[PDB]
Design an enzyme around this catalytic site. Structure first.
Site, PDB file in Angstrom:
ATOM      1  N   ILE A 194       0.777  -1.245   0.000  1.00 54.11           N
ATOM      2  CA  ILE A 194       0.000   0.000   0.000  1.00 54.11           C
ATOM      3  C   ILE A 194       0.808   1.296   0.000  1.00 54.11           C
ATOM      4  O   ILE A 194       0.211   2.375   0.045  1.00 54.11           O
ATOM      5  CB  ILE A 194      -1.185   0.008   1.012  1.00 54.11           C
ATOM      6  CG1 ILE A 194      -0.702  -0.108   2.477  1.00 54.11           C
ATOM      7  CG2 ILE A 194      -2.227  -1.061   0.638  1.00 54.11           C
ATOM      8  CD1 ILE A 194      -1.684   0.388   3.565  1.00 54.11           C
ATOM      9  N   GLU A 219       5.258   3.195   0.307  1.00 57.46           N
ATOM     10  CA  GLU A 219       6.677   3.263   0.665  1.00 57.46           C
ATOM     11  C   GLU A 219       6.838   4.353   1.732  1.00 57.46           C
ATOM     12  O   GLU A 219       6.511   5.521   1.488  1.00 57.46           O
ATOM     13  CB  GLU A 219       7.558   3.619  -0.560  1.00 57.46           C
ATOM     14  CG  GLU A 219       7.116   3.067  -1.909  1.00 57.46           C
ATOM     15  CD  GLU A 219       7.821   1.803  -2.363  1.00 57.46           C
ATOM     16  OE1 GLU A 219       7.496   0.714  -1.838  1.00 57.46           O
ATOM     17  OE2 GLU A 219       8.681   1.902  -3.266  1.00 57.46           O
ATOM     18  N   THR A 258       9.256   6.214   5.056  1.00 54.23           N
ATOM     19  CA  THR A 258      10.583   6.805   5.209  1.00 54.23           C
ATOM     20  C   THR A 258      11.574   5.687   5.562  1.00 54.23           C
ATOM     21  O   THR A 258      12.668   5.627   5.004  1.00 54.23           O
ATOM     22  CB  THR A 258      10.559   7.910   6.290  1.00 54.23           C
ATOM     23  OG1 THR A 258       9.503   8.838   6.022  1.00 54.23           O
ATOM     24  CG2 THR A 258      11.881   8.651   6.398  1.00 54.23           C
ATOM     25  N   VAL A 270       5.107  -0.490   3.504  1.00 51.27           N
ATOM     26  CA  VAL A 270       3.804  -0.490   4.168  1.00 51.27           C
ATOM     27  C   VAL A 270       2.857  -1.420   3.396  1.00 51.27           C
ATOM     28  O   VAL A 270       2.676  -1.269   2.183  1.00 51.27           O
ATOM     29  CB  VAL A 270       3.216   0.931   4.385  1.00 51.27           C
ATOM     30  CG1 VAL A 270       1.929   0.876   5.208  1.00 51.27           C
ATOM     31  CG2 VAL A 270       4.231   1.853   5.056  1.00 51.27           C
ATOM     32  N   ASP A 309      -5.314   8.937   2.375  1.00 45.23           N
ATOM     33  CA  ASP A 309      -4.496  10.011   2.934  1.00 45.23           C
ATOM     34  C   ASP A 309      -4.944  11.358   2.343  1.00 45.23           C
ATOM     35  O   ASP A 309      -5.605  11.368   1.300  1.00 45.23           O
ATOM     36  CB  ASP A 309      -2.981   9.760   2.736  1.00 45.23           C
ATOM     37  CG  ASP A 309      -2.467   9.663   1.310  1.00 45.23           C
ATOM     38  OD1 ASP A 309      -2.608  10.650   0.555  1.00 45.23           O
ATOM     39  OD2 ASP A 309      -1.805   8.662   0.990  1.00 45.23           O
ATOM     40  N   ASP A 355       7.841  15.662  11.501  1.00 43.69           N
ATOM     41  CA  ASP A 355       7.769  15.470  10.049  1.00 43.69           C
ATOM     42  C   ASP A 355       6.334  15.350   9.471  1.00 43.69           C
ATOM     43  O   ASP A 355       5.988  14.379   8.780  1.00 43.69           O
ATOM     44  CB  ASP A 355       8.717  14.351   9.588  1.00 43.69           C
ATOM     45  CG  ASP A 355       8.972  14.288   8.094  1.00 43.69           C
ATOM     46  OD1 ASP A 355       8.842  15.342   7.415  1.00 43.69           O
ATOM     47  OD2 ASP A 355       9.259  13.186   7.594  1.00 43.69           O
ATOM     48  N   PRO A 398       0.900  16.086   4.175  1.00 44.16           N
ATOM     49  CA  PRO A 398      -0.411  15.471   3.839  1.00 44.16           C
ATOM     50  C   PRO A 398      -0.414  13.935   3.658  1.00 44.16           C
ATOM     51  O   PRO A 398      -1.441  13.287   3.890  1.00 44.16           O
ATOM     52  CB  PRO A 398      -0.829  16.204   2.558  1.00 44.16           C
ATOM     53  CG  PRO A 398      -0.113  17.519   2.626  1.00 44.16           C
ATOM     54  CD  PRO A 398       1.214  17.202   3.259  1.00 44.16           C
ATOM     55  N   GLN A 399       0.746  13.361   3.280  1.00 42.83           N
ATOM     56  CA  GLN A 399       0.988  11.922   3.082  1.00 42.83           C
ATOM     57  C   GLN A 399       0.755  11.109   4.381  1.00 42.83           C
ATOM     58  O   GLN A 399       0.149  10.038   4.326  1.00 42.83           O
ATOM     59  CB  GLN A 399       2.434  11.719   2.593  1.00 42.83           C
ATOM     60  CG  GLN A 399       2.647  10.648   1.525  1.00 42.83           C
ATOM     61  CD  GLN A 399       4.132  10.391   1.301  1.00 42.83           C
ATOM     62  OE1 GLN A 399       4.881  11.237   0.778  1.00 42.83           O
ATOM     63  NE2 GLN A 399       4.598   9.215   1.715  1.00 42.83           N
ATOM     64  N   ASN A 400       1.230  11.612   5.538  1.00 42.97           N
ATOM     65  CA  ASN A 400       1.064  10.898   6.821  1.00 42.97           C
ATOM     66  C   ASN A 400      -0.186  11.338   7.615  1.00 42.97           C
ATOM     67  O   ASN A 400      -0.248  11.155   8.831  1.00 42.97           O
ATOM     68  CB  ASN A 400       2.360  10.920   7.679  1.00 42.97           C
ATOM     69  CG  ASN A 400       2.920  12.289   8.013  1.00 42.97           C
ATOM     70  OD1 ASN A 400       2.192  13.275   8.196  1.00 42.97           O
ATOM     71  ND2 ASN A 400       4.239  12.373   8.149  1.00 42.97           N
TER      72      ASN A 400
HETATM   73  C1  LIG Z   1      -3.361   6.234   2.205  1.00 44.72           C
HETATM   74  C2  LIG Z   1      -4.099   4.895   2.087  1.00 44.72           C
HETATM   75  C3  LIG Z   1      -3.215   3.699   2.462  1.00 44.72           C
HETATM   76  C4  LIG Z   1      -2.448   3.904   3.776  1.00 44.72           C
HETATM   77  O1  LIG Z   1      -1.345   4.448   3.753  1.00 44.72           O
HETATM   78  N1  LIG Z   1      -3.080   3.434   4.864  1.00 44.72           N
HETATM   79  C5  LIG Z   1      -2.683   3.435   6.153  1.00 44.72           C
HETATM   80  N2  LIG Z   1      -3.418   2.866   7.105  1.00 44.72           N
HETATM   81  N3  LIG Z   1      -2.853   2.960   8.205  1.00 44.72           N
HETATM   82  C6  LIG Z   1      -1.641   3.493   8.078  1.00 44.72           C
HETATM   83  C7  LIG Z   1      -0.648   3.798   9.012  1.00 44.72           C
HETATM   84  C8  LIG Z   1       0.527   4.431   8.598  1.00 44.72           C
HETATM   85 CL1  LIG Z   1       1.755   4.754   9.778  1.00 44.72          CL
HETATM   86  C9  LIG Z   1       0.711   4.760   7.246  1.00 44.72           C
HETATM   87  C10 LIG Z   1       1.846   5.455   6.830  1.00 44.72           C
HETATM   88  C11 LIG Z   1       1.729   6.807   6.485  1.00 44.72           C
HETATM   89  C12 LIG Z   1       2.853   7.537   6.086  1.00 44.72           C
HETATM   90  C13 LIG Z   1       4.103   6.915   6.023  1.00 44.72           C
HETATM   91  C14 LIG Z   1       4.221   5.560   6.349  1.00 44.72           C
HETATM   92  C15 LIG Z   1       3.097   4.834   6.764  1.00 44.72           C
HETATM   93  C16 LIG Z   1      -0.313   4.494   6.329  1.00 44.72           C
HETATM   94  C17 LIG Z   1      -1.477   3.825   6.737  1.00 44.72           C
END
Ligand SMILES: CCCC(=O)Nc1n[nH]c2cc(Cl)c(-c3ccccc3)cc12
Length: 290
Positions: free
Chosen positions: A10, A12, A14, A18, A78, A119, A122-124
């Protein structure tokens, strides 16, 4: 991991890959993060207890065959993806307000337990169909410092970085997260990044072209900072009505307090929640396609 069945890659991160996974015993869908000292282990183990509705839950921490596994609660999308889908129309003001309100609530809780993200992007930042928004990867920067490049050699964004970090400040305060949130707030309203720098100096000069080059008047101690150079060009401060149109005065006032140079004068997450901008907050639901 053995207790999990992977569904798909789902993203990449840092630090590592994932995956969307399912637990074989509980049947619960989870987000499974796989990375690659003892102190880094302690730091992440404390985060299993930093629980709040606006913080992504750290379900488990698994250290096996010398590799780190992080089990998180799953959220379907996200903010980065939401902003791109809503680019031609814009995110409605009531939704922008609610997201900021909820984000400020998440920050206020963490900053009360002396925990900072460091850090924000909008991604996290993760969203659901019920109108909720949550902060992901909170506390991982203290465990392992922010690298120049990711595990895939991808460039780590400078766009949301606070000016004290860029000037070589060694002791970061919680004001760093308030800066990043302010930058994200402006981006939601504008449909364009506030300071999209492509080097540390480009990022620093972009902040200066808009907010004015800081001095001892606005920022006491700036000239004594590690990476400060008296050879810096002297730009004048731009208005604010030009910075974030067509955002109202309550929104312009709050953003201004979030983007103050001096970390000591920059509004706290607790105080931001008391701003008259949040007089009419509601919790609207977005039109999510999954
Ligand atoms: C954006 C849709 C997919 C997704 O990332 N889902 C996540 N569900 N729960 C999550 C928990 C985390 Cl921690 C991160 C995630 C977000 C930014 C960088 C690394 C990991 C992503 C998801």
């Amino acid at each position: 991991m053995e207790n999990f069945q992977k569904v798909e890659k789902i993203g990449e991160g840092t630090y590592g890959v994932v995956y969307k996974a399912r637990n074989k015993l509980t049947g619960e869908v989870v987000a499974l993060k796989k990375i690659r000292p003892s102190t880094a282990i302690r730091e992440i183990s404390l985060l299993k207890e930093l629980n709040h509705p606006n913080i992504v839950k750290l379900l488990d921490v698994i250290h096996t065959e010398n590799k780190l596994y992080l089990v998180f609660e799953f959220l379907h999308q996200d903010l980065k993806k939401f902003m791109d889908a809503s680019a031609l129309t814009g995110i409605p003001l009531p939704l922008i307000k609610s997201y900021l309100f909820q984000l400020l609530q998440g920050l206020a809780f963490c900053h009360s337990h002396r925990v900072l993200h460091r850090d924000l992007k909008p991604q996290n930042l993760l969203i659901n169909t019920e109108g909720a928004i949550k902060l992901a990867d909170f506390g991982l920067a203290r465990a392992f410092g922010v690298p120049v490049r990711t595990y895939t050699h991808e460039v780590v964004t400078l766009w949301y970085r606070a000016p004290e970090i860029l000037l070589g400040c060694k002791y970061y305060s919680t004001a760093v997260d308030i800066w990043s949130l302010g930058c994200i707030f402006a981006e939601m309203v504008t449909r364009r990044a506030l300071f999209p720098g492509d080097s540390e100096i480009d990022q620093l000069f972009r902040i200066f072209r808009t907010l004015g080059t800081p001095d001892e008047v606005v920022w006491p101690g700036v000239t004594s900072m590690p990476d400060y150079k008296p050879s810096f060009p002297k730009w004048a401060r731009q208005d604010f009505s030009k910075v974030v149109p067509p955002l109202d005065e309550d929104g312009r006032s709050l953003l201004s307090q979030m983007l103050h140079y001096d970390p000591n004068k920059r509004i706290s997450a607790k105080a931001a929640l008391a701003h008259p901008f949040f007089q009419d907050v509601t919790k609207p639901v977005p039109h999510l396609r999954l």
